[PDB]
């Protein structure tokens, strides 16, 4: 099992969701970026693992689920079986990262990508050691009822040129944003 990563798109007001939807209108090229970052593994014969909370799983548009080309694992204490075609269920990130060592997943998973929601991102941010955050900073406020946690710049550093990540400001539907990559050690 490879590198642990979060990926999020977040408004200037730190928002990531509202009533089970995104806060902003669809940004197709931003969705393409999510898809290419989470799907791409260069270890031959393996796939990345995408980890999401119960509510994020049900919220993602159903005709995209499970996320193709990726192993889909849902975190819940409530569910007793993986919901709707997800491959795996665990109670927590720690349990998920354990399962990754068991025979069924051991020679199957390259990178891990945490894809939401808020309590899952908090768990990952609280997880000791290396974590890379791929943050799309949407440069205006949108009304949100769920939020991404603070990024501690004493722990994370921006990585200003990242291969396969556009540096310049992007725009779709009049809404500007920037793809950013952060990394922590500790
Ligand atoms: N950078 C980044 N990181 C994320 N975690 C991220 N998550 C979503 C969540 N999402 C949504 C959650 C709830 C309602 C609506 C959502 C709208 C779109 C999608 C689409 C996803 O993959 C399908 C690709 C669509 C295509 O083939 O064109 C996956 C998540 C997601 C959207 N953009 C993101 N962008």
Q: What is the CATH number of the domain that holds 184?
A: 3.40.430.10
Structural domain for 96, as ranges: 1-186
Residue stretches of the annotated binding site for substrate:
30-35, 64, 70
29 lines ligand 1 (CB under 6 A): no
Is 99 annotated in the active site?
no
Domain total for the chain?
1
Q: What angle do CA 50, 160, 133 make, to 5 degrees?
A: 25
**Does residue 22 have an active-site annotation?**
yes
- Strands (DSSP E) contained in the chain are 4-11, 15-17, 47-53, 71-75, 88-90, 109-116, 131-138, 146-147, 156-158, 170-172, 175-184
Q: How far apart (Å, rounded) are the C-alpha atoms in residues 64 and 26?
A: 14
Q: Would you say 76 and 89 are in contact if contact means Cβ atoms under 8 Å apart? A: yes
Annotated binding site for NADP(+): 9, 15-21, 54-56, 76-78, 116-123
Q: Is 177 in the pocket of ligand 1 (CB under 6 A)?
A: no
Q: Measure 103 CA to ligand 1 centroid, in angstroms.
A: 30
Would the CB of 39 count as within 6 Å of ligand 1? no
Pocket test for ligand 1, best of 31, 40, 52 (most atoms within 8 A of CB): 31
Atom of ligand 1 minimally distant from the CA of 67: 22
Torsion of CA 24, 26, 30, 31, to 10 degrees: 120
This entry's atomic model was obtained through: X-ray
For tokens 């989470």, the residue is: 38
Structure's resolution in angstroms: 1.8
Per-position DSSP letters for 61-84, written without gaps between them? -GGG-SPTTSEEEEE-SS-SS--T
């Amino acid at each position: 099992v490879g590198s642990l990563n979060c990926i999020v798109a977040v408004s200037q007001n730190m928002g990531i969701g509202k009533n089970g939807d995104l806060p902003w209108p669809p940004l197709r090229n931003e969705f393409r970026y999510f898809q290419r970052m989470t799907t791409t593994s260069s270890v031959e014969g393996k796939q990345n693992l995408v980890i999401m909370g119960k509510k994020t799983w049900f919220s993602i548009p159903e005709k995209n689920r499970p996320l193709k080309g990726r192993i889909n694992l849902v975190l819940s204490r409530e569910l007793k079986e993986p919901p709707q075609g997800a491959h795996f269920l665990s109670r927590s990130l720690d349990d998920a990262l354990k399962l990754t060592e068991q025979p069924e997943l051991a020679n199957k998973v390259d990178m891990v990508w945490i894809v939401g929601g808020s309590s899952v991102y908090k768990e990952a941010m609280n997880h000791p050691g290396h974590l890379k955050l791929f943050v799309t900073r949407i440069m205006q406020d949108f009304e949100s009822d769920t939020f991404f946690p603070e990024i501690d710049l004493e722990k994370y550093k921006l990585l200003p040129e990242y291969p396969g990540v556009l540096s310049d400001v992007q725009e779709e539907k009049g809404i500007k944003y920037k793809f950013e990559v952060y990394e922590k050690n500790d």
